[PDB]
Structure formats: C-alpha cells, structure tokens
Amino acid sequence: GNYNYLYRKPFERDIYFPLQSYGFQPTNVGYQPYRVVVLSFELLHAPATVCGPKKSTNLVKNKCVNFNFNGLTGTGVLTESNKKFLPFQQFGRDIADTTDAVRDPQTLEILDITPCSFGGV
C-alpha cells in the first residue's frame, strides 16, 4: 500500500525505531485511510481576527441595547469611558466576572457597559 504514511504534552511533536508505516490499499472499513482536520479556537481576550460572516450594525450610545462585540453577547446602556485599556486588552471585568467595559473592534475607543435601569416594584 501507500507506505509513505507513517505513525509513532498537549500539541506534542516528535521527529526497534519509532516509525511504523500504514499499508493503505483500496481493498482494506477501519483499516482504510481517513483524513482529519482538528480546529483549535483561540477565545482569548485580545483583538478577535477570525470572525463569522455575521454583518456589523452601526453603534448606539446612552440607550439600552442588546449588544454583541466579537461574540460577547449582552444587554446594557453603552457609554464612552475614561478607562485606560493597555494596547493588548480588549475587555474589562467586574468582581462578578461579567464584562464591565469593552474596546470596539472597528474604532478602537473604550465603552462602559451599564446594565439597563431596574428595581423592585
């Protein structure tokens, strides 16, 4: 078969001796070759740079809105803010882990998120 295909921490790479070769022949189902792609998604709080086809709206300020920034879905009154985000930081967090401020992905300004007005009746 196609013996040009061979086998041997997380995301470890390593290049009797260790290699063995697959006998991939069309006559082989479990003994047949399969291709595999593994997609790893880097969620981390830097700027996003691989995003879905979902089209951006305009921005809205000083009014309660059902926002989404880079997949960060939420609801609140968005307002301009004085928070000095360092260049590597995209989001800011509350004591409760809930996002308290964001940097917008298209214009690099910083918004506070304030939850919409509420109380007991």
Ligand X SMILES: *[C@@H]1O[C@H](CO)[C@@H](O)[C@H](O)[C@H]1NC(C)=O
Ligand Y SMILES: *[C@@H]1O[C@H](CO)[C@@H](O[C@@H]2O[C@H](CO)[C@@H](O)[C@H](O)[C@H]2NC(C)=O)[C@H](O)[C@H]1NC(C)=O
Q: Nearer to ligand Y by C-beta: 14 or 97?
A: 14
- Expressed in percent and rounded to 5, the helix, strand and coil fractions of the chain are 0, 25, 75
What is the 8-class DSSP label of residue 116? Answer: P
Q: Tell the smallest beta-carbon distance from residue 22 to ligand Y (Å).
A: 24
106 binds ligand X (CB under 6 A): yes
Tokens at 92, concatenated: 């800011």
Number of H helices, E strands in the chain: 0, 9
Gaps in the chain (C to N over 2.5 angstroms) fall after 8, 15, 28
- Lay out the site mask for another protein across 14-53 (x = CB under 8 A, - = otherwise): -x----------------------------xxx-------
Question: Of ligand Y, ligand X, another protein, none, which one sits near residue 107, judging by CB under 5 to 8 A according to partner kind?
Answer: ligand X
Count residues near ligand X (CB under 6 A): 3
Count residues near another protein (CB under 8 A): 21
Positions touching ligand X (CB under 6 A) are: 15, 106-107
